[PDB]
């Protein structure tokens, strides 16, 4: 499975190229995996992925939460992987055919799919939470190996780990800004995703170092 | 509501700028409303919206199926409207806070949100279909005025029309390539979305004219 340095993935959701590159540079010694989403890509373009690879050599997860019909999902993944992304996130709610479409392209291009199971925000309780266990089982049936689950609900994160098994790889956003605890989250997740607590910090480097200090026993 | 020429919206999912522009230009006499999705945007950049506005007299719906947490949804909408999109599509299944985030940006920036209710592909049956009526009702309670529903399931499109009422605006994909019929769909939708049936045709203009001829009594 993916080996994430310090079990810490930077969510780089700044929307200015100079700021994104500066801040990522400031925390580069602590990470080797950056999650890039639509806030940055739609503001600066898909070439920003190649630029991160050129500058940092970091692994890039494109957090695009692909959620279309199969035919369109295929096109989105192709474009995304052409841009240099190592992995892409995919919603499970739209069903198995939509997920399989992404799995196909990933296999073809030597990339990874991360299946989003339950989201960490309050609205996730309305529809997603009630489908989340079934979505995880669907992932298992499909041979999905990488999953995303909620730091803000450690009991749900734990259940999701139970479903997918210890061999699957699980990452978790919602740490810090949204209320999730780094150490508690790493009881169940392989790696935590952290955005604002780092990139909005007066001193991002000290922010990252602080978080890592707090989980040092968990490596 | 937006005044969609010939009740027909082109889904421009070609991924090459030259082809996308050629084909759109060829059908411009029949349409004035173009849906641009991630296949084209991730391939050619957000400036493709600007290029389409410069070249054609078309409104642009950015079919981004926004499906993140509220804070990220806000950023995606801001970047998308900054680029000149008239409207953006938004998934309802991540819950009310996620939708409201998009509505708030849309209200602030004087643009529109289309709420996706049930999707037209087979996988939609697994999870979305069971939530779709409640997602539509949620949209009504939030004040959403624009909706997307499936051509491929007339009975579901009819029900979704009932929920949102006759005053709401409803557009429907799944016509042609996915099996939906233009005429039957327009019994309930204000406009049909058509992609491959047009953009893959040897003569896209003849394809569009042919669809229009078949629904002329509904125009
Ligand atoms: O369920 C969730 C919640 N958040 N995120 C993403 O993870 C990051 C969390 O950032 P934050 O640490 O600033 O809250 C953001 O990019 C957000 O879109 C998810 O992918 N899934
Ligand atoms: O439920 C659906 C089904 N399709 N689409 C989108 O509408 C277009 C359908 O194109 P087609 O006519 O080539 O099938 C594509 O852009 C597809 O992503 C949706 O937004 N929702």
Q: At what angle do helices A128-142 and A96-109 cross, to 10 degrees?
A: 50
Residue A141's CB: how many other CB atoms inside 10 A?
9
Strands A8-12 and B87-91, sheet pairing: unpaired
Nearest to B37 among A13, A72, A91 (CB): A72
Phi, psi torsion values for A45, nearest 5 degrees: 100, 160
Q: What whole-number distance in Å separates Cα of residue A163 and Cα of residue A147? A: 11
Looking at the structure of chain A, the number of domains it has is 1
Q: What whole-number distance in Å separates Cα of residue A120 and Cα of residue A130? A: 13
Kindly report the nearest CA distance between residue A64 and chain B, in angstroms: 9
Strand partners, B192: B8, B172
Nearest to A121 among B15, B43, B98 (CB): B98
Torsion, Cα B159 B164 B170 B173, to 10 degrees, reads -40
Which method was it determined by? X-ray
Atom of ligand 1 nearest to the CA of A89: 20
Kindly report the nearest CA distance between residue A51 and chain B, in angstroms: 15
Catalytic residue among B54, B65, B82, B216: B65
Ligand with minimal distance to A149 CA: 1
CB A82 within 8 A of CB A62: no
Shortest CA distance to A161 belongs to which of A131, A125, A134, A189? A189
Shortest CA distance to B6 belongs to which of B156, B210, B151? B210
Q: At what angle do helices B154-164 and B128-142 cross, to 10 degrees?
A: 20
A6-39 burial, b for 16+ CB within 10 Å, e for fewer?
bbbbbbbbbbeeeebbebbebbbebbbbbbbbbb
A68-103 burial, b for 16+ CB within 10 Å, e for fewer?
bbbbbbbbbbbbbbebbbbbbbbbbbbbbbbbbbbb
Q: Which tokens in the block code for residue B130?
A: 């069971």
The answer to whether the CB of A154 is under 6 A from ligand 1 is no
Q: Which tokens in the block code for residue A9?
A: 């993935």
Q: Which tokens in the block code for residue A183?
A: 């150490």
Give percent helix, percent strand, percent coil of chain B, each to the nearest 5. 50, 20, 30
Q: What whole-number distance in Å separates Cα of residue B33 and Cα of residue B35? A: 7
Going by the DSSP 8-state scheme, the letter that residue B175 receives in this structure is: B
- From chain A residues 159-198, the ones with a CB under 8 A of any chain B CB are 177-178
- Yes or no, beta carbons of A43 and B79 under 8 Å apart: yes
Provide, as residue numbers in chain A, all residues whose Cβ is less than 8 Å from the Cβ of B45: 45-46
- Yes or no, beta carbons of B72 and A37 under 8 Å apart: yes
- Candidate from B10, B11, B35 with most ligand 2 atoms within 8 A of CB, to mutate: B11
Q: What whole-number distance in Å separates Cα of residue A160 and Cα of residue A141? A: 14
Nearest to A93 among B64, B71, B93 (CB): B93
Q: What whole-number distance in Å separates Cα of residue B47 and Cα of residue A7? A: 36
Resolution, rounded to a tenth of an Å?
1.3
CB B79 within 8 A of CB A115: no
Q: Which tokens in the block code for residue A166?
A: 């210890």
In Å, what is the CA distance from B210 to each residue of B10, B27, B200? Answer: 14, 12, 14
Kindly report the nearest CA distance between residue A101 and chain B, in angstroms: 11
- Domain containing residue B138: CATH number: 3.20.20.70
Q: B133: nearest CA in chain A? A: A127
Kindly report the nearest CA distance between residue A70 and chain B, in angstroms: 8
CB A186 within 8 A of CB A192: yes
Q: Which domain holds residue A216?
A: 1-219
Handedness of CA B119, B125, B131, B132 (dihedral sign): positive
CB A111 within 8 A of CB B52: no
Which residues have C-beta within 8 Å of that of residue A88, sequence separation ≥ 6? A61, A62, A63, A64, A66, A76, A77, A80, A81, A102, A106, A111, A112, A113, A114
Phi, psi torsion values for A19, nearest 5 degrees: -65, -45
Helix (H/G/I), strand (E/B), else coil: B162: helix
Q: What is the SS3 string spanning chain A?
A: CCCCHHHEEEEECCCCHHHHHHHHHHHHHHCCEEEEEHHHHHHHCCHHHHHHHHHHCCEEEEEEEECCCHHHHHHHHHHHHHCCCCEEEEECCCCHHHHHHHHHHHHHHCCEEEEECCCCCHHHHCCHHHHHHHHHHHHHHHCCCEEECCCCCHHHHHHHHHHHCCCCEEEECCECCCCECHHHHCCCCCEEEECHHHHCCCCHHHHHHHHHHHCHHHC
Which residues have C-beta within 8 Å of that of residue B166, sequence separation ≥ 6? none
The residue whose C-alpha atom lies closest to atom 18 belonging to ligand 1 is B72
Q: What whole-number distance in Å separates Cα of residue A10 and Cα of residue A30? A: 10
- Yes or no, beta carbons of A135 and B122 under 8 Å apart: no
Helix (H/G/I), strand (E/B), else coil: B171: strand
Ligand with minimal distance to A157 CA: 1
Helix (H) or strand (E) holding B9: strand B8-12
Residue B174's CB: how many other CB atoms inside 10 A?
25
CA Rg value for chain B: 16
- From chain A residues 80-119, the ones with a CB under 8 A of any chain B CB are 80, 82-83, 91-99, 119
CB A64 within 8 A of CB A42: no
Shortest CA distance to B64 belongs to which of B35, B44, B96? B35
Q: What whole-number distance in Å separates Cα of residue A11 and Cα of residue A177? A: 12
The answer to whether the CB of A6 is under 6 A from ligand 1 is no
Q: Which tokens in the block code for residue A196?
A: 């604002």
Ligand-binding site membership of B173 (annotated): yes
Which residues have C-beta within 8 Å of that of residue A36, sequence separation ≥ 6? A12, A48, A49, A52, A60, A61, A62, A63, A85
Query: How far away, in angstroms, is A206 Cα from ligand 2 center?
Result: 46
The answer to whether the CB of B194 is under 6 A from ligand 2 is yes
Q: How many Å from the N-terminal Cα to the C-terminal Cα in chain A? A: 17
Q: Is B143 exposed, middle or buried (0-12, 13-18, 19+ CB in 10 A)?
A: exposed
Which residues have C-beta within 8 Å of that of residue B41, sequence separation ≥ 6? A42, B48, B49, B62, B64
Nearest to A67 among B65, B125, B138 (CB): B65
Helix (H/G/I), strand (E/B), else coil: B121: coil
- Yes or no, beta carbons of B75 and A39 under 8 Å apart: yes
CB B120 within 8 A of CB A69: yes
B103-116 burial, b for 16+ CB within 10 Å, e for fewer?
bebbeeeebbbbbb
Phi, psi torsion values for B63, nearest 5 degrees: -85, 75
Which residues have C-beta within 8 Å of that of residue B85, sequence separation ≥ 6? B36, B49, B60, B61, B62, B111
The residue whose C-alpha atom lies closest to atom 21 belonging to ligand 2 is B119
């Amino acid at each position: 499975v993916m080996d994430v340095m310090n079990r810490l993935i930077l969510a780089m959701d700044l929307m200015n190229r100079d700021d994104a590159l500066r801040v990522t540079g400031e925390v580069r010694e602590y990470i080797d995996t950056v999650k890039i989403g639509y806030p940055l890509v739609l503001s600066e373009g898909m070439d920003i992925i190649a630029e991160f690879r050129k500058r940092f050599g970091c692994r890039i997860i494109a957090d695009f939460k692909v959620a279309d019909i199969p035919e369109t999902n295929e096109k989105i993944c192709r474009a995304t992987f052409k841009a240099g992304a190592d992995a892409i996130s995919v919603h499970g709610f739209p069903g198995a055919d939509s997920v399989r479409a992404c799995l196909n392209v990933a296999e073809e291009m030597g990339r990874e799919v991360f299946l989003l199971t339950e989201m960490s925000h309050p609205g996730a309780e309305m529809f997603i939470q009630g489908a989340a266990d079934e979505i995880a089982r669907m992932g298992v049936d499909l041979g999905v190996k990488n999953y995303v689950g909620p730091s803000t609900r450690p009991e749900r994160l734990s259940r999701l780990r139970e479903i997918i098994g210890q061999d699957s790889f699980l990452i978790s956003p919602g740490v810090g800004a949204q209320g999730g605890d780094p150490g508690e989250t790493l009881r169940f997740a392989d790696a935590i995703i952290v955005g604002r607590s780092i990139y909005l910090a007066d001193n991002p480097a000290a922010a990252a170092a602080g978080i890592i200090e707090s989980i040092k026993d968990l490596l």
